[PDB]
Design a protein around this ligand. Structure first.
Ligand SMILES: CCCCCCCCCCCCCCCCCC(=O)OC[C@H](COP(=O)([O-])OCC[N+](C)(C)C)OC(=O)CCCCCCCCCCCCCCCCC
Ligand SMILES: CCCCCCCCCCCCCCCCCC(=O)OC[C@H](COP(=O)(O)OCCN)OC(=O)CCCCCCCCCCCCCCCCC
Ligand SMILES: CCCCCCCCCCCCCCCCCC(=O)OC[C@H](COP(=O)(O)OCCN)OC(=O)CCCCCCCCCCCCCCCCC
Ligand SMILES: CCCCCCCCCCCCCCCCCC(=O)OC[C@H](COP(=O)(O)OCCN)OC(=O)CCCCCCCCCCCCCCCCC
Ligand SMILES: CCCCCCCCCCCCCCCCCC(=O)OC[C@H](COP(=O)(O)OCCN)OC(=O)CCCCCCCCCCCCCCCCC
Ligand SMILES: CCCCCCCCCCCCCCCCCC(=O)OC[C@H](COP(=O)(O)OCCN)OC(=O)CCCCCCCCCCCCCCCCC
Ligand SMILES: CCCCCCCCCCCCCCCCCC(=O)OC[C@H](COP(=O)(O)OCCN)OC(=O)CCCCCCCCCCCCCCCCC
Ligand SMILES: *[C@@H]1O[C@H](CO)[C@@H](O[C@@H]2O[C@H](CO)[C@@H](O[C@@H]3O[C@H](CO)[C@@H](O)[C@H](O)[C@@H]3O)[C@H](O)[C@H]2NC(C)=O)[C@H](O)[C@H]1NC(C)=O
Ligand SMILES: COC(=O)C1=C(C)NC(C)=C(C(=O)OC)C1c1ccccc1[N+](=O)[O-]
Ligand SMILES: *[C@@H]1O[C@H](CO)[C@@H](O)[C@H](O)[C@H]1NC(C)=O
Ligand SMILES: [Ca+2]
Ligand SMILES: [Ca+2]
Lengths: 100, 97, 1274
């Protein structure tokens, strides 16, 4: 419920940050996509225990789906974060949160 | 044991008293050095000559080969080489077995 | 006199007493006290021999001599005020503690009729650095360098505290289930395996032994010393992993219990962040300190001390050459012979008979033939007389006097004299059975004759020679530090190894020679922690006073490797800067002399050169390099290995298409593009080709013009170097030829150490398990031969190479000490004095000669940023302050309005809110350190009471920063983005911990990562972290080569070493194999560190057996492995160690401005605080501010940038109008140009009329202005 819900909340920060000239807002949108990434990875681990305690096991259609949506949301969130945090400053004069 | 303490005085004591010296560093070295002193104690028997060749009978004990209770009569064999002429005697003070 | 008081001179001629020798009889008394502490022999359980009894009768005599002088200085000086003054002096206090703390323990002892109060006596050798002032100044240059390093050592401490907490949370209580025999308490391990954890039904390693059951209650992995289940043991075992000594056994243990797939990350990341990054920072800061120090000397007067006396010596030898030919200058023929000798031909025929000798020396080996022995005796006696003739001819051909002068002609005298001295000694009947070895040792000098042939480091060796006054004094105070520690080791651990095991703990602390050796082994880092576990077990165990011995162990590693930076690196940053400057000075000497005697075809090309086209190919190299790494080594009949083979035939059609299209337009790097493509089509000896199929990735480098330019730089780094690489190779040959003459034939052993030779070592013998004489097993006995031995010269060299890497050097050293005779088995402590060879080699190679190799790459890269010569009107400090003044840009502050929000705004930005909330992170640390294993159930719930009570607090500092900063201004700071993430991450964990019990260890790390918030306040730590993180990110190409190298090696490694079996007891086991690409890379990483890298090399060399899931004809189970391992392993250790000194030096030299800044005068650290006061006058930037606030800006400034600790009425009123500024409207003077004349005043200060001349200079040497200087000109 948290992996779905967090993603929904994240969208509301991301859909509203493409309008009205605000880009600061996006910073939290990239937070909730890491969390929505990591709240499937608990889910993935939680589902593995059920099959381990219970005759064989094989996953075909929706573990490797969610293990491609974990790796998408977990790494499309951290990269969106670094593609929205300003830069490493690279010069002695420059500072983060530098004007404009 | 394996150690660095000086062994010269101990060797001297053994030499002075007509005993012997034995090192033991290891557990597998215990079994042949704590039986080996009977080579020294047998010496004045092998110098007694024929007088020392007396049969002795052992206490009853179980046989090595599972025979049952038994007693063994023993005799010692001496190493006599070149007796005719009394040529050596360097290792002629031990029993052959 | 200026006594300031006094009693009369009734006895106070004590100041007469103290003239010349009293300073040197009490320096001779103290050396006699250090030999009495050395010859003490510590015995277990209060047992003493008779020399220890006569040595405590000497202590009383040494206690009063030091005790009367401590009274004869409180009377030679004056009354008690004087005593306070003396207290100020450092030496008196040290000398008064030692001899007041000496009478304190002699009296509690003499009453008692204390064995930890005997320990303070070891402090005596420090009293000897008091009596030498030439050593008192060496200590201060140690301690002065310490302040710069403070920001680092505070960063290492906050990095051990994160991973001690994180590690604890992740692995607490896990490692308590080892394999056990059923119904018994005997731990069940294999023969060379140490006890490691198990797991019933998890991911761990289940028991796979015939009769063992996995049960709990096991104390833990090294006698319980290593694990993470409280805070002190978690942090002792994170500190050990940081020093890269034993960090894989912790990782392996962790996998075994917890599982294989995750814990690689905690360890790899720690090693990379913890050691390599920190090592780079520490190294860079120290180097900067040395440059600054060099600067204070060379600009003061120290350049002309070494230039004159090097010129006054070379003018002396020229003056004395004008004499020695004059007085010297009976037959003309002799003169002709001398002329011929000068002639070059003679210089290609000294290299002829010296090359005879090297071959002769190298041909000694063990159990050699009989013709080979006698040929060396023939060639010796020939080349002795050939060496006789040259010396006689030389000394008689050009003069007897000036033969004496040369630094090499003196040695040519020594060769033939001690060459004939051996040929006269044996051939008299006087071999003297050690001297027939001891006199053969000296014809190992004849291979030192090639030392004159260099003429290349002839400049640096000479510089080094001058400096043997300076070389020796720091080595003296490192040697006085290894003595004190050895003595201390003797006090704590002497006679305390009385363990009743039958195993050998040979690096102990029982003699003084042995203690010294043990101490040296802890400084080289080698196996230092297995020396510590014997010292925790010699006290109780992993208990409360038992483990406080570990602090002693920690000090010797840390504070003792601080000296080794100041010694070796100081040498390599000072004496390789004079020998370079002088090389430039002899270069300006050079060519100034030589100037004196002189005075359809178009479309395809477009598609190919298309940018879109390139990004279509460089993701076919990204797919074909994933297909090399996904291959399965053992099973060639897999469906995986088949279905990856169709991906082979897909891409190497496409690179063919790239090849033929390329020779439609055009007619060295493209002979590599031809080769790769042919190899696949051929591969679809096949085996050899396959390895040559992994070089596809390398071709990708041309693709990137960055990757083109960096392989060029790496190739350049091989140009200037290969005289150091040659000099070291010639010396590795001299120590390998001494080591052959010392240890040849002698590394044989029997299986049981009773049978002393090979004729005896046949049969079976009984081994005994855990030292229990009732439980034995038969094992056959064989005459084993050591894996690293000195048996021919090539063999000796390999051993030396392993020793330089410091891996296994302790084992070799012990093997050397026990060595008996030419072909016999070992004797315990037969020749302890063969530690000298190993130690000398280590000082010579691994300390001293590798450190003029790091100190060389630096100084030839300082000039890469100095051969570009900037002689304009503005110097270094101007470019880094004016260009900043051109390109500066204002901050933001967001002071809001609507004073309800201003009410919340000022409460949040206060100092007592930053003091409140950086004191609650300090309470959240302590609540997370309090966690332990088998804590109580009342401890169990208040940890969930507290962790929910911290999350409600930190959620409420986040609402107060949302409503005040008006959230647009909240996600503007990067530290509020990160703090938003740690808040939300720990609210979910509060939920997910509680929906657990209402009806994930990854979210419990959202509690501990809030401690990184403590970097937001420390300014000096964050400027240090930003500087290197900027540079690593700005130089990804440098690290890329390392990555490329790893990729190439891993691909090869799976292909050769892929089919060894994972049997446990060997070094290719289930943690350390070459079966998969991720595994191979991990194995390689272990090697960069040097963990048991030689061991791995031994493990995979032909004899090894293949796993059953591979295919092979039966009877051939023992045929995998390869001998290519020697080349491969040696190659990786050398290419990876050269790319790591290339990466470190490349990052030190992009931040050379931070590191040689000298924070006194100026930096941008003043230029930052200007804007942070300007931020109080600008909400957002707008350029300019009012002029009413300009005078209130200058009151806020530090006086090296603005105006003083005086009142601003005279200087600050008059200068602000008189010094220039642009005049726009009343309250409009800009940011961009007020900061100019404010820093143009502080330095680069000029007269009027030439206000255009500062603007004239700001266009030529400066980066383009961009048109912004049109208000900065005016
Ligand atoms: C990123 C992914 C992390 C995944 C963590 C995880 O899944 O843990 C479960 C597992 C727990 O395993 P488990 O739940 O199978 O426990 C096993 C229990 N037995 C043994 C009884 C079967 O955690 C680990 O085992 C170790 C994971 C290491 C993760 C390292 C992340 C932190 C290191 C970087 C810190 C950076 C600090 C910079 C300063
Ligand atoms: C993920 C979310 C973002 C995480 C980092 C957010 C905080 C941040 O990026 O701060 C940058 C910090 C200081 O930067 P600043 O104050 O702008 O000064 C630069 C002067 N040129 O500069 C630094 O970060 C210095 C190094 C700190 C490293 C912190 C690592 C935290 C992640 C783990
Ligand atoms: C500070 C200088 C320390 C000098 C230490 C030393 O000289 O040790 C002498 C010691 C002699 O011991 P021993 O042979 O028992 O003779 C004692 C007198 N009967 O000999 C020893 O115990 C070992 C001495 C080793 C000295 C090494 C010096 C190079 C480091
Ligand atoms: C300074 C040297 C003081 C030496 C005092 C001393 O030797 O005290 C013995 C005591 C040992 O106690 P314990 O660890 O229980 O082991 C005893 C055997 N079971 O000592 C201890 O309990 C441990 C003392 C640790 C001190 C560490 C000093 C290194 C710094
Ligand atoms: C600097 C190195 C200091 C090391 C101090 C230390 O190791 O203390 C150990 C102590 C363990 O105590 P505790 O966690 O209560 O466990 C008791 C036995 N299970 O550790 C503790 O009690 C908790 C200490 C927490 C310190 C947090 C520091 C981060 C700020
Ligand atoms: C330059 C050549 C140096 C050779 C010195 C030498 O002659 O060493 C011979 C000596 C023999 O020692 P060993 O083989 O143990 O025989 C003892 C018999 N009772 O060797 C010794 O006893 C120990 C000598 C230590 C060797 C030091 C090696 C470093 C040399 C640096 C130069
Ligand atoms: C880079 C390529 C290095 C190749 C190293 C090599 O091939 O060494 C093999 C040789 C083996 O000698 P040994 O230790 O006696 O083993 C016997 C079984 N081959 O061992 C040797 O010959 C060692 C030679 C390497 C010496 C390393 C120190 C100098 C490095 C210069 C580069
Ligand atoms: C009974 O005593 C005789 C001597 O009284 C023992 O004979 C001696 O045995 C030793 C064994 O070490 C022989 O010495 C060996 O000599 C050979 C040369 O053949 C040499 O190669 C060896 O290194 C060793 O020195 C010695 O020849 C021999 N003495 C005589 C006089 O024959 C005999 O061993 C004793 N009996 C038993 C069963 O031990
Ligand atoms: C840097 O390369 C190494 O890793 C070295 C180490 C650790 N071990 C040994 C003993 C070296 C050696 O003796 O070279 C002949 C080398 C070496 C050090 C310095 C200069 C050159 C080389 N080299 O040639 O490999
Ligand atoms: C393992 O132990 C069992 C029980 O003694 C034995 O029967 C079996 O032979 C052993 N393993 C093999 C492969 O023989
Ligand atoms: Ca090491
Ligand atoms: Ca090591």
């Amino acid at each position: 419920v948290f992996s779905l819900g967090f993603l929904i909340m994240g969208t509301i920060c991301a859909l509203m940050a493409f309008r009205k000239k605000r880009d600061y807002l996006l910073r939290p949108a990239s937070m909730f996509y890491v969390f929505a990434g990591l709240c499937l990875f608990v889910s993935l681990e939680v589902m593995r225990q059920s099959v381990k305690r219970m005759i064989e096991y094989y996953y075909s259609w929706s573990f490797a789906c969610a293990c491609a949506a974990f790796v998408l949301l977990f790494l499309g969130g951290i990269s969106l974060l670094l593609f929205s945090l300003p830069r490493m400053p690279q010069n002695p004069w420059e500072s983060c949160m530098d004007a404009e | 044991g394996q150690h660095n303490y000086d062994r010269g005085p101990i060797q001297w004591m053994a030499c002075e008293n007509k005993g012997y010296y034995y090192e033991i560093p290891s557990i597998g070295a215990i079994r042949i050095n704590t039986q080996e002193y009977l080579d020294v104690l047998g010496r004045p028997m092998v110098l007694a000559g024929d007088k020392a060749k007396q049969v002795q009978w052992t206490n009853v004990y179980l046989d090595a080969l599972e025979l049952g209770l038994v007693i063994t009569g023993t005799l010692p064999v001496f190493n006599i080489t070149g007796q005719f002429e009394n040529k050596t005697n360097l290792k002629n003070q031990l029993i052959l077995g | 006199f200026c006594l300031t008081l006094q009693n009369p001179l009734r006895k106070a001629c004590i100041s007469i007493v103290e003239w010349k020798p009293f300073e040197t009889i009490i320096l001779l008394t103290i050396f006699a006290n250090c030999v009495a502490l050395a010859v003490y022999l510590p015995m277990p359980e209060d047992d003493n021999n008779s020399l220890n009894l006569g040595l405590e009768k000497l202590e009383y005599f040494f206690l009063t001599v030091f005790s009367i002088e401590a009274a004869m200085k409180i009377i030679a000086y004056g009354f008690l005020f004087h005593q306070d003054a003396y207290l100020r002096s450092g030496w008196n206090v040290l000398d008064f503690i030692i001899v007041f703390l000496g009478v304190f323990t002699a009296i509690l002892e003499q009453v008692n009729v204390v064995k930890a109060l005997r320990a303070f006596r070891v402090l005596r050798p420090l009293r000897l650095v008091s009596g030498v002032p030439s050593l008192q100044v060496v200590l201060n240059s140690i301690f002065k360098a310490m302040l710069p390093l403070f920001h680092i050592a505070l960063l290492v401490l906050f990095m051990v505290i994160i991973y001690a907490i994180i590690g604890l949370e992740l692995f607490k209580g896990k490692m308590h289930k080892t394999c056990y025999y059923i119904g018994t308490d005997i731990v069940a391990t294999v023969e060379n395996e140490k006890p490691s954890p198990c797991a019933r039904t998890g991911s761990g390693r289940p028991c796979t032994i015939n009769g063992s059951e996995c049960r709990g209650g096991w104390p833990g992995p090294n006698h319980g010393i290593t694990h993470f289940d409280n805070f002190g043991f978690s942090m002792l075992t994170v500190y050990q992993c940081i020093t890269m000594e034993g960090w894989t056994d912790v990782l392996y243990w962790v996998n075994d219990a917890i599982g294989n797939e995750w814990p690689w990350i905690y360890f790899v990341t720690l090693i990379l962040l913890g050691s390599f990054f920190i090592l780079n920072l520490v190294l860079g800061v120290l180097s900067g300190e040395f440059t600054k120090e060099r600067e204070k000397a060379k600009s003061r007067g120290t350049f002309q001390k070494l230039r004159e006396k090097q010129q006054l010596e070379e003018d002396l030898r020229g003056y004395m050459s004008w004499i020695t030919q004059g007085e010297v200058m009976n037959r003309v023929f002799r003169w002709k012979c001398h002329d011929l000798v000068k002639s070059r031909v003679f210089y290609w025929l000294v290299i002829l008979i010296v090359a005879l000798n090297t071959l002769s020396i190298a041909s000694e080996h063990h159990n050699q033939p009989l013709w080979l022995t006698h040929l060396q005796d023939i060639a010796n006696r020939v080349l002795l007389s050939l060496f006789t003739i040259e010396m006689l001819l030389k000394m008689y051909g050009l003069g007897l006097r000036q033969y004496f002068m040369s630094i090499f002609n003196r040695f040519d005298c020594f060769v033939v004299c001690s060459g004939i001295l051996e040929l006269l000694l044996v051939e008299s009947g006087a071999m003297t059975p050690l001297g027939i070895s001891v006199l053969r040792c000296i014809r190992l000098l004849r291979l030192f004759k090639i030392t004159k042939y260099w003429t290349s480091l002839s400049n640096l060796v000479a510089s080094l020679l001058n400096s043997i006054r300076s070389i020796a004094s720091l080595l003296l105070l490192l040697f006085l530090f290894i003595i004190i520690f050895a003595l201390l080791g003797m006090q704590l651990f002497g006679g305390r190894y009385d363990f009743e095991d039958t195993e050998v703990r040979r690096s102990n602390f029982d003699n003084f020679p042995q203690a010294l050796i043990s101490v040296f082994q802890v400084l080289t880092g080698e196996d230092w922690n297995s020396v510590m576990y014997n010292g925790i077990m010699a006290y109780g165990g992993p208990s409360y006073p038992g483990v406080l011995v570990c602090i002693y162990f920690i000090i010797l590693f840390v504070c003792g490797n601080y000296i080794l930076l100041n010694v070796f690196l100081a040498i390599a940053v000072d004496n390789l800067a004079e020998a370079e400057s002088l090389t430039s000075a002899q270069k300006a000497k050079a060519e100034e002399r030589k100037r004196r005697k002189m005075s359809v075809r178009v479309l395809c090309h477009r598609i190919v050169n298309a940018t879109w086209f390139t990004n279509f190919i460089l993701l076919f190299i990204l797919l074909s390099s994933a297909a090399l790494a996904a291959e399965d080594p053992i099973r060639a009949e897999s469906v995986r290995n088949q279905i990856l083979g169709y991906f082979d035939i897909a891409f190497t059609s496409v690179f063919t298409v790239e090849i033929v299209l390329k020779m439609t337009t055009y007619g060295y790097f493209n002979i590599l593009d031809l080769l790769v493509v042919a190899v696949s089509l051929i591969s679809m000896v096949v085996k050899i080709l396959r390895v040559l199929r992994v070089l596809r990735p390398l071709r990708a480098i041309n693709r990137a013009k960055g990757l083109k330019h960096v392989v060029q730089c790496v190739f350049v780094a091989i140009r200037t170097i290969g005289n150091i690489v040659l000099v070291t190779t010639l010396l590795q040959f001299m120590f390998a030829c001494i080591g052959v003459q010392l240890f040849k034939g002698k590394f044989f052993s029997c299986n049981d150490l009773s049978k002393m030779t090979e004729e005896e070592c046949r049969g079976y013998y009984y081994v005994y398990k855990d030292g229990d004489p009732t439980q034995m097993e038969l094992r056959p006995r064989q005459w084993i031969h050591n894996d690293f031995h000195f048996d021919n010269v090539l063999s000796a060299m390999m051993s030396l190479f392993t020793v330089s890497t410091f891996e296994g050097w302790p084992q070799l050293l012990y093997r050397a000490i026990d060595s008996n005779e030419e072909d016999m088995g070992p004797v315990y402590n037969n020749r302890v004095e063969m530690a000298i060879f190993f130690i000398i080699y280590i000082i010579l190679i691994a300390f001293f000669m590798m450190n003029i190799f790091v100190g060389f790459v630096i100084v030839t890269f300082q000039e890469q940023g100095e051969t570009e010569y900037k002689n304009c009107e503005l110097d270094k400090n101007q470019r880094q302050c004016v260009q900043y003044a051109l390109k500066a840009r204002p901050l933001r502050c967001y002071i809001p309005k609507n004073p309800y929000q201003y009410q919340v705004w000022y409460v949040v930005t206060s100092s007592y809110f930053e003091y409140l909330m950086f004191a609650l992170i300090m309470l959240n640390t302590i609540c997370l350190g309090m966690q332990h294993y088998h804590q109580s159930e009342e401890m169990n719930h208040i940890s969930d009471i507290l962790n929910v009570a911290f999350t409600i607090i930190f959620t409420l500092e986040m609402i107060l920063k949302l409503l005040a900063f008006k959230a647009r201004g909240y996600f503007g700071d990067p530290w509020n983005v990160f703090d938003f993430l740690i808040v939300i991450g720990s609210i979910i964990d509060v939920i997910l911990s509680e929906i657990d019990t209402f009806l994930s260890a990854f979210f419990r790390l959202f509690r501990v990562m809030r401690l990184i918030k403590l970097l937001s306040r420390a300014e000096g730590v964050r400027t240090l972290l930003w500087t290197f993180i900027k540079s690593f990110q700005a130089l990804p190409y440098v690290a890329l080569l390392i990555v490329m190298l790893f990729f190439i090696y891993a691909v090869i490694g799976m292909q050769m070493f892929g089919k060894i079996a994972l049997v446990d007891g060997t070094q290719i086991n289930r943690n350390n194999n070459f079966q998969t690409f991720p595994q191979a890379v991990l194995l390689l990483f272990r090697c960069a560190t040097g963990e048991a890298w030689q061991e791995i090399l031994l493990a995979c060399s032909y004899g090894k057996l293949c796993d059953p899931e591979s295919d092979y004809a039966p009877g051939e189970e023992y045929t995998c492995g390869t001998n290519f391992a020697y080349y491969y392993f040696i190659s990786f250790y050398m290419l990876c160690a050269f790319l790591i000194i290339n990466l470190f030096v490349a990052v030190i030299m992009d931040n050379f401005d931070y590191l040689t800044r000298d924070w006194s005068i100026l930096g941008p650290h003043h230029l930052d605080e200007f804007k942070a006061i300007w931020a109080e006058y600008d909400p957002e930037a707008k350029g300019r501010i009012k002029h009413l606030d300009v005078v209130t800006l200058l009151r806020r400034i530090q006086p090296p940038l603005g105006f003083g600790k005086f009142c601003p009425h005279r200087v600050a009123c008059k200068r602000l109008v008189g010094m220039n500024m642009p005049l726009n409207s009343d309250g409009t003077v800009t940011f961009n140009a007020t900061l100019f004349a404010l820093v143009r005043t502080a330095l680069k200060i000029k007269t009027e009329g030439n206000f255009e001349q500062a603007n004239e200079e700001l266009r030529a040497i400066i980066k383009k202005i961009w048109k912004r200087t049109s208000m900065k000109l005016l």
